[PDB]
Write a protein that binds this DNA or RNA. Structure first.
Lengths: 38, 99, 264, 349, 68, 94, 444, 215, 181
RNA sequence: AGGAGAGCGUCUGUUGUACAUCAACACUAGAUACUGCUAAUACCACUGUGGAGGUAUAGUAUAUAAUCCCUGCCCGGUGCAGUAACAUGUAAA
RNA sequence: UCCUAUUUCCUAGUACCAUUAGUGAACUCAUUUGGUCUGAUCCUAAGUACGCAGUGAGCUAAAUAGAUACAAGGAACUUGACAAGCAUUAC
RNA sequence: AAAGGAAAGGUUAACCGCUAUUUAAACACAAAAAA
RNA sequence: AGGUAUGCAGUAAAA
RNA sequence: UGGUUCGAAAAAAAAAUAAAAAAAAAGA
RNA sequence: UGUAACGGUACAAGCUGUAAACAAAGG
């Protein structure tokens, strides 16, 4: 295949995805998103 | 000819001679007034930034002036709102008219 | 698919400067406004309380000001009225506006009663004349007024284009070597005298060369900007309050008609 | 369509009320007294009681016909484009429809919930807004002033912005003689003047009406298109007979409300488009003929070179479409007194 | 690509007479590196040109041998 | 029904046709009290443009609809009826 | 859908202008952080209603209510005077934690009720052995902010902090030292002890964010010892990257004070550190808007009527000058208001004295106006002109600023009320003078 | 993947190791390999509590080793693999310097790979044109005023250690001779600011003639 | 194309930009500028020099250099130079245009209602082609082959052949005007 | 791709990507037929959806088409309409 | 005591993830030199005060694809003016 | 004329909602209840 | 003509 | 500077991810 | 249950879970 985990690509990451994809690595949470992007 | 002129001007730059240029008639190679159009755009951007700064200053000043000693107060309506609420039998009271 | 926005807007706008100039024209001169002149007046009611009250309390004035015909309204402020009107005139105006509002409220709810109709008619006519003395045919925007007064004309804009000051008196640390045309607008709807308009240089103009690159050749009001626009002896404080059917210009003095003025 | 308010709000077979009341008085008894006073005032003001006919409409139209500073100074507009008339002279408002009385139109593009095309030959067209027009005239015994007349892209007639005496704004269908500054009212005591809304039982014979309710209080449904109108033929205690624009004679309950006059914009039919592009803007798509297709695609298709229909005309679905009746035979006529015949027969007899 | 998943090997199955050398770009890059080293007192080009076991201090060479 | 703000009730209007009687001043009875204003606004919001009729078996004269009088079908198309192995879960489970 | 060509063009132009407006709007937001921190580990887990009747409140409830009101900016005079009455009733039954929270609320809200602090301080002194770091810090902090000066009690608080050094929080100790320096309450032995402890606290317990709070020019000039001065000035060069304009300003003022009054220490610094501060002197350190006060404006008006050219509220070096004359630039004036002294006294603040001495030694001829004397002139202009002329006819003030006569809280309150009345009258008769009032309408 | 950090640790398992970079790092900066799930606050607290380091800033990147295909050796299996592990590269800026020989790589075999020597004059990637934001001194707020060298206090602090006149820092081998202001010359030679000195005479403003045919 | 939707005026527009309608007076208006009594607030010049550009008329004696801060353009600014005002490919002779894809100078005119165009290849030389186009246009004008530039003599001369053609048409349709057929 | 003409389509358009760019299709308009609203017609889970939140100057179906003059005769046949069924009507059916 | 008020208000170090900020279809595709050339726009340009890019060697045969120049004749060619030709030529 | 944006947020207004709320950061400063 | 810097609810008006 | 986050607006779910771990006695 | 992703381990088709091959000798 040309998209996906095939050919050694593995699971998707924000580095390999378009802007808008949300995926972290396991960090703890330290706060709250506001209603205005903060 | 462009190559020759560039060589000469670069030679003067390297030598450190004064930054003089040929003064004669420069032909106009373009049609658009990009300089002035871009200047107008920059003017508009600067005005917008100034407006944002004014808005911020007014926001903070309004909050802080609202919270001042001798100005801020805790108040409630003089006449209890229970006395001024609509009686349950009022025609405009919810459920008292056909829908 | 993308969620880039803001400074990373994926929209491929044109870079052609001529097209962008046309866009400027369409976005500023040909912009469409939904609200009306009375909408703007209500938005500024807190600063123009007296005129808002008159517009809402005098019969016919709201109808006249809500008509489609492109109009220009010069709105005085309560501060302007208080400063320029005599105390008795201000008291009379407030009392009569309150009287009209009170009669309206009575409607919501001998000879002595008969005189009420005459007084109402008199007050309505006088206040309608006063309010409509500020309504002018056509839409006269601020830049149009300035260009009509001559600002922007290279032959006439002298005394407004090269203002300078004694710099060393105000920015001394940078000057060690020195340390040693009346346009006429159509008459108000309630009068026949056309309105004079002129321009002057503000006190802030002289300080521009201190902080800007210049290419020169060989009490005072605190309103901002480099140019001041005067209409009928009154200064424009906030202009280009555009609407769908006209424009509102805020002024610092009421334009009382000669008929309502007192000769002695 | 059903993409607006939900079924629970839109569907109600039996409406239990005909007067949308908005009383101001503190108690029900005082509200009733005020309603009686308002009805009596409307009755006192009402003076016209004669029928409103085609000839009276023509006379009013004739009377209405018989009876440089205003611009944006210093504003050089487009090089070629200009409005047909300035705002202070155009018949219509020239402005924008009220935002609080309209919403964006959901364009189904001729496709149903299945996603297939059910209504053929539909195109995107120009963006449109649906505006909330009061087909009910629910507010009774309160006078309103027509402030302006407005274009409607979904409707063949013109709309009128009505401001009630208490400040309420609404949109109603405009009559052929409706002009700014007109005073209108809905009541049984109202005079017989164009724009007024009355029960069909209080409108004299020969009068011309529009926006007729099939069920009392459910909002007018009959005679809405521009220039259309219906005529009052006969009246009895319970029913009133109307002749409709289709030449159909039908009875209506005497309690169904209606508005006096003809529907505005009677010149709609006179419009000439001039090019395919105008219909393209209006929202049409090309219509391919049945006989231009292959036999698998239409009954009329097939045949070397051009040919005739080769049979009595039928649609894509095999139904005769010239003279073949489609109304259900068993469906009762109900209040229909007589239904029109073919136009050829009508014009030849 | 480095993982050899593309089809770039298809063209390499056909002969070509030659290939561009990009010498202008490569020389600009090389001279940038040389300047970065030289501002600190390093003669990278001299080091690269030295013969095996050859020692030349400063800016010296066969001409220094000739005149000394 | 839309009720504009009490500080600007006057909507934009065209020029009144000649001879039209002067409109009386607006009666803003709903500005005496904020509670009255809110009640009136909610009452106005309760209004509806129209009420629609629909098939309902609870009504004595209700009815439903079948297919067209002629009884034909789209030319060249052999429509397959829905089944549990055809259009099984379109728009709803059952 | 499609649009008519005019509509297409107008909306397209609107979109372009919106994009450009956004770009212009975001231009100056260099110091706008989408990630922001909020402090909440001081909020108590108990719930309270601030308007509850005070007579039902105890220390634990009233302290929490005061702190919550201060956090929520519910600055109501009646509410806070009820707080004062109830707290004075409950003075006998407050723990150090409750007293600390009360002082925090009062200082944070800047509620200048001197009587409450005066009545609560004796119990603070008595209960000092049981106090903890936060409570000591808060008492000192509130007193410094509101200008309530009690040197004996402040010194006792500092001594208690020294005794509990092993338990004190570094930030609390730094704040206590700064407050002691600003209030001028430490004799030489206490100053030496505090400097010795602060040296170790900063070297062992404070990272950059905690250390930057120790950079205060008043403490450097009047309190810190020479080794502490050297260590602080050296460490600021390392910790500058994490600092803000206030920290930079105080570091610059400290360097100038050391250079002007301690040339030996300035020389004992190293060349690299001196270079750092020389380069700091060249930077544009963001100040904040300052404007003449009503008293400042009155003095300026009287001076102008006298006929002396002058300029107001300008920055020279790392100082702000109230009035700077134009004809003779070295002549300057300072208008001293109620907050320039300690409450109920005419004693100048340490910052004011330090600024006076530094400017005097750098060459300025300073003259000073006291509001206590100015208020007695009233609205008269001839009297004020004569006052300023007589002050001008006399020599400048010494490099050491001496305190004025004795006063009392009664006289302070009386003078504040008189100043209020004078402000009102002057504003009224300024605006009335501005108003023309010349249009007369024949409407009647 | 890595276990989430508890509120109280008592026994940290995270390994912070020094990373030898082939790129350039400043004097007071050091690069560390760290577990991917740690935050900047966690890293700073870890370093300040376990080592006592005085950390000023932490910057983070996520490094994923690139895909590699086994294609070369005899009997090659054309399978994909990654060398090393995914990790967080934490660049820590401290109060004191860190040795270059520690933080960066060196080589006498490939003479071009000496980042400690080449510094930021080279980009160590495919980047051709280096992007650098304006410096703090170049900014306006907390920036260096271009006329502060003439003020009294800076000159009082300078003493004999520093000379503040910018004329003394002019590079003779780069600047050109002063021209006559009355004759054609370039602005970029000696002005180095965005305005026109008054000593330059009045300049002619030329507006394009877009419709010559009309006249 | 000469659209009907382009703006009428071809000038560079500087619209009046009003501030949000409810902002109070800006900070720099509090300054006191009496020489005897001075107070210059913070950011006075920064705020005022940008507020002055609002009206769109007083753009500054050095516009747009007073709002152009980027050094990219200042590095290119020259002094005491004389500049042309006309794009080199524009001709003052009406009807002369340039087609760049074809590399030709075109002369477009109207002659007897018809719209006609002729090409002049520029590969022989830009100046030569442009001058050939201008000479052709002027020759057409002089000989009266451009309708709008014709003279009374040209109109009279052309009317003769117009008359001949009209008589031919009359003979063509003679049988209809007489009443036969 | 000029001047003078004829044929076919009025025209601007669509069009078979990769053998058909055409006289083929569409088109502005004139007609006819159906449809009184839970309208007809379409989709064919059918108290549902599009039609349409529209209402006979509307919607749907089938021809012929834009401008001018014209558009003859036939209801015997087939279909449709009409009636209890007839009679009778309807061809731009 | 003539400013529309003479109204305290700088940047709290800052969660997680993306980015090689330039030339360049840089995408789908693959006879894939990534980058030059093949088109508008983007810097008041003597081509933007020396920029970006430049691929083994030989050799007079014809034939082919083109480019230029063709005496006199001028469509006699061809199914058909297809293809060509004109639209440069004292200055 | 083919008849065109209004959800969240900011501004102004209104407001008897609430730590689901602006540093235990700092600067400035004639300033304020009751009696 | 998406949302800008104490933040959650919440009504109206609008370049 | 963007994503994230509120809205558009979506279980119309990007496996190994989160303001997202049993959810206030939190011990200030 | 089964499988897989990352991480550790000879950078692995094995083993294994941040204790990532080993505790067996504790009031």
């Amino acid at each position: 295949a040309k998209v996906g985990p095939s050919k050694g690509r593995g699971p998707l990451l924000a580095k390999f995805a378009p802007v808008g994809f949300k995926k972290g690595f396991g960090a703890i949470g330290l706060g709250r998103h506001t209603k205005k992007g903060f | 000819i462009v190559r020759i002129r560039k060589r000469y001007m670069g030679q003067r730059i390297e030598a450190g001679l004064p930054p003089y240029v040929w003064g004669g008639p420069w032909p106009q190679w373009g049609r658009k007034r990009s300089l002035f159009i871009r200047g107008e755009m920059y003017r508009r951007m600067l005005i917008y930034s100034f407006d944002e700064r004014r808005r911020r200053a007014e926001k903070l000043r309004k909050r802080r002036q609202a919270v001042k000693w001798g100005v801020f107060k805790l108040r409630q309506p003089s006449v209890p709102p229970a006395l001024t609420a609509l009686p349950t039998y009022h025609p405009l009271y919810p459920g008292n008219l056909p829908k | 698919w993308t969620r880039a926005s803001g400074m990373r807007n994926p929209v491929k706008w044109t870079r052609d400067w001529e097209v962008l100039n046309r866009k400027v024209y369409f976005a500023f001169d040909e912009r469409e406004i939904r609200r009306s002149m009375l909408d703007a007046v209500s938005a500024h009611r807190k600063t123009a309380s007296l005129f808002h009250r008159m517009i809402n309390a005098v019969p016919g004035v709201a109808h006249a000001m809500s008509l489609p015909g492109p109009h220009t309204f010069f709105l005085p402020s309560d501060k302007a009225c208080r400063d320029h009107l005599s105390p008795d005139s201000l008291h009379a105006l407030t009392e009569r506006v309150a009287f009209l509002e009170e009669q309206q409220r009575q409607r919501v709810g001998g000879g002595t009663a008969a005189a009420i109709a005459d007084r109402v008619a008199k007050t309505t006519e006088q206040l309608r004349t006063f309010v409509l003395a500020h309504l002018i045919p056509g839409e006269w925007r601020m830049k149009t007024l300035l260009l009509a007064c001559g600002a922007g004309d290279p032959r006439r804009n002298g005394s407004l284009r090269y203002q300078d000051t004694d710099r060393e008196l105000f920015a001394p640390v940078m000057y060690a070597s020195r340390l040693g045309s009346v346009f006429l607008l159509p008459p108000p709807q309630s009068t026949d005298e056309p309105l004079p308009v002129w321009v002057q240089a503000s006190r802030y103009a002289a300080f521009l060369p201190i902080t800007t690159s210049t290419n020169f050749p060989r009490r005072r009001s605190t309103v901002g900007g480099a140019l001041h626009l005067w209409v009928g002896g009154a200064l424009v404080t906030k202009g280009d309050l555009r609407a769908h059917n006209g424009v509102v210009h805020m002024i610092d003095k009421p334009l009382i008609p000669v008929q309502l003025l007192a000769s002695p | 369509s059903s993409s607006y308010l939900p079924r629970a709000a839109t569907h109600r077979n039996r409406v239990a009320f005909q007067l949308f009341a908005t009383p101001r008085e503190p108690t029900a008894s005082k509200a009733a007294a005020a309603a009686r006073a308002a009805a009596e005032a409307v009755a006192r003001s009402s003076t016209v009681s004669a029928p409103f006919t085609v000839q009276k409409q023509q006379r009013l139209l004739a009377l209405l016909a018989a009876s440089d500073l205003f611009r944006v100074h210093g504003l050089p507009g487009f090089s070629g484009f200009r409005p047909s008339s300035p705002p202070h002279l155009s018949k219509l408002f020239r402005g924008r429809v009220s935002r609080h009385l309209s919403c964006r139109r959901v364009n189904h593009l001729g496709r149903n919930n299945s996603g297939r095309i059910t209504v053929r030959f539909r195109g995107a067209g120009h963006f449109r807004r649906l505006r909330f027009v009061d087909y009910k005239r629910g507010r009774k015994d309160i006078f309103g002033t027509v402030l302006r007349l407005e274009y409607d892209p979904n409707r063949s007639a013109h709309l009128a912005l009505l401001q009630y005496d208490d400040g309420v704004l609404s949109y109603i269908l405009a009559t052929e003689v409706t002009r700014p500054g007109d005073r209108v009212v809905a009541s049984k005591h109202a005079s017989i003047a164009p724009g007024n809304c009355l029960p069909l039982g209080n409108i004299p014979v020969s009068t011309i009406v529009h926006n007729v309710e099939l069920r009392p209080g459910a909002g007018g449904q009959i005679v809405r298109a521009g220039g259309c109108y219906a005529t009052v033929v006969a009246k009895d205690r319970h029913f009133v007979t109307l002749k409709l624009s289709s030449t159909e004679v039908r009875r209506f309950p005497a309690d169904c409300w209606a508005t006096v006059g003809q529907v505005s914009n009677a010149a709609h039919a006179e419009r000439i488009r001039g090019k395919a592009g105008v219909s393209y803007w209006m929202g049409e798509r090309p219509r391919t003929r049945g006989k231009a297709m292959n036999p698998v695609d239409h009954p009329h298709g097939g045949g070397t070179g051009k040919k005739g229909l080769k049979r009595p005309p039928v649609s894509k679905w095999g139904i005769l479409c010239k003279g073949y009746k489609t109304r259900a035979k068993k469906k009762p006529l109900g209040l229909i007194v007589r239904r029109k015949k073919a136009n050829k027969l009508i014009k030849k007899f | 690509n480095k993982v050899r998943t593309d089809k770039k090997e298809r063209k390499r199955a056909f002969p070509q007479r030659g290939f561009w050398k990009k010498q202008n770009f490569l020389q600009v890059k090389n001279n940038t590196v040389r300047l970065a080293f030289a501002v600190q007192g390093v003669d990278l080009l001299k080091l690269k040109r030295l013969r095996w076991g050859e020692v030349r201090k400063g800016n010296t060479g066969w001409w220094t041998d000739d005149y000394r | 029904y839309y009720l504009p703000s009490g500080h600007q009730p006057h909507a934009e209007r065209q020029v009144f046709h000649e001879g039209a009687g002067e409109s009386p001043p607006l009666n803003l009875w709903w500005r005496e009290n904020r509670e009255l204003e809110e009640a009136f606004r909610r009452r106005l919001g309760e209004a509806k443009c129209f009420e629609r009729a629909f098939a309902d078996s609870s009504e004595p004269l209700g009815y439903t609809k079948g297919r067209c009088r002629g009884g034909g079908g789209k030319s060249g198309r052999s429509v397959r009826r829905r089944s549990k192995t055809h259009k099984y879960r379109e728009n709803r489970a059952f | 859908g499609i649009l008519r060509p005019r509509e297409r063009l107008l909306l397209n132009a609107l979109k372009k202008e919106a994009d450009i407006r956004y770009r212009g709007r975001r231009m100056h937001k260099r110091f706008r952080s989408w990630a922001q921190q909020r402090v909440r580990h001081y909020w108590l887990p108990q719930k309270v209603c601030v308007t509850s009747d005070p007579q039902l409140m105890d220390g634990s409830y009233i302290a929490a209510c005061v702190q919550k009101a201060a956090t929520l900016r519910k600055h109501d005079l009646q509410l806070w005077h009820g707080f004062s009455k109830r707290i004075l009733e409950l003075a006998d039954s407050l723990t150090p934690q409750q007293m600390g929270y009360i002082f925090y609320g009062y200082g944070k809200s800047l509620f200048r009720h001197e009587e409450l602090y005066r009545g609560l301080l004796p119990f603070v002194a008595e209960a000092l052995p049981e106090f903890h770091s936060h409570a000591l810090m808060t008492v000192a902090w509130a007193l410094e902010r509101v200008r309530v000066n009690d040197r004996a009690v402040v010194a006792q608080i500092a001594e208690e902090a020294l005794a509990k050094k092993d338990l004190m929080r570094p930030a609390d100790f730094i704040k206590i030292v700064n407050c002691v320096a600003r209030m001028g309450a430490a004799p030489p032995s206490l100053a030496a002890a505090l400097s010795a402890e602060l040296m170790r606290v900063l070297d062992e317990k404070c990272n950059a964010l905690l250390f930057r709070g120790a950079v205060d020019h008043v403490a450097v000039a009047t309190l810190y010892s020479d080794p502490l001065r050297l260590y602080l000035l050296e460490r600021f060069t390392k910790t500058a990257i994490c600092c803000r304009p206030m920290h930079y300003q105080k570091a610059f003022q400290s360097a100038v004070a050391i250079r002007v009054l301690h040339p030996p220490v300035w020389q004992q610094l190293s060349k690299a550190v001196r270079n750092f501060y020389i380069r700091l002197s060249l930077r544009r350190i963001p100040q904040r808007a300052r404007r003449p006060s009503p008293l400042h404006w009155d003095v300026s008006n009287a001076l102008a009527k006298l006929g002396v050219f002058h300029r107001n509220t300008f920055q020279w070096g790392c100082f702000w000058i109230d009035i700077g004359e134009i004809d003779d630039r070295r002549q300057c004036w300072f208008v001293d208001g109620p907050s320039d002294f300690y409450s109920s006294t005419n004693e100048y603040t340490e910052a004011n004295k330090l600024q006076h001495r530094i400017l005097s030694e750098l060459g300025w001829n300073i003259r000073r106006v006291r509001w206590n004397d100015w208020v007695q002139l009233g609205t008269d202009m001839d009297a004020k002109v004569e006052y300023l002329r007589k002050l001008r006819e006399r020599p400048p003030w010494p490099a050491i600023l001496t305190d004025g006569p004795s006063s009392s809280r009664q006289e302070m309150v009386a003078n504040l009320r008189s100043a209020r009345d004078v402000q009102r009258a002057l504003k009224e008769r300024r605006e009335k003078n501005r108003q023309p009032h010349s249009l007369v309408m024949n409407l009647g | 993947t890595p276990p989430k950090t508890p509120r109280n640790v008592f026994f940290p398992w995270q390994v912070f190791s020094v990373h030898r970079t082939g790129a350039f790092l400043e004097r007071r900066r050091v690069a560390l390999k760290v577990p991917v799930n740690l935050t900047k606050f966690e890293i700073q607290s870890y370093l300040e509590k376990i080592y006592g380091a005085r950390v000023l800033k932490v910057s983070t990147l996520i490094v994923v080793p690139r895909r590699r295909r086994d294609i070369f050796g005899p009997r090659p299996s054309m399978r994909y693999y990654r060398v090393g592990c995914t990790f967080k590269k934490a660049i820590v800026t401290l109060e004191d310097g860190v040795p270059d020989a520690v933080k960066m790589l060196r080589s006498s075999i490939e003479l071009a790979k000496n980042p400690d020597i080449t510094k930021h004059n080279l980009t160590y990637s495919g980047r051709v044109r280096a992007f650098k934001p304006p410096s703090a001194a170049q900014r306006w707020e907390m920036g260096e005023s271009k006329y502060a060298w003439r003020l009294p206090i800076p000159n009082l602090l300078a003493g004999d250690e520093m000379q503040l006149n910018p004329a003394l820092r002019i590079d003779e081998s780069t600047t050109q001779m002063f021209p006559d202001f009355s004759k054609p010359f370039f602005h970029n030679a000696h002005f180095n600011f965005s305005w026109k000195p008054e000593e330059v005479p009045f300049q002619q403003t030329v507006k394009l003639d877009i419709t010559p045919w009309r006249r | 194309s000469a659209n009907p939707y382009k703006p009428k005026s071809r000038e560079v527009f500087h619209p009046y930009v009003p501030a949000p309608e409810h902002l109070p007076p800006p900070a720099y208006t509090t300054a006191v500028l009496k020489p005897m009594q001075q107070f210059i607030p913070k950011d006075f010049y920064r705020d005022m020099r940008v507020d002055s550009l609002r009206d769109g008329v007083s753009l500054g004696s050095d516009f747009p250099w007073n709002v152009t801060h980027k050094y990219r353009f200042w590095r290119r600014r020259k002094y005491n130079v004389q500049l042309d005002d006309r794009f080199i490919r524009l001709s003052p002779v009406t009807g002369v245009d340039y087609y760049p894809r074809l590399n030709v100078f075109a002369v477009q005119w109207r002659e007897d209602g018809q719209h006609r165009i002729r090409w002049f290849r520029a590969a022989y030389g830009l100046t030569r082609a442009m001058r050939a186009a201008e000479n052709f246009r002027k020759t057409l004008e002089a000989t009266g082959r451009v309708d709008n530039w014709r003279t009374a003599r040209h109109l009279r001369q052309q009317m003769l052949e117009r008359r001949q053609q009209l008589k031919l048409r009359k003979k063509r349709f003679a049988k209809i005007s007489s009443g036969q057929f």
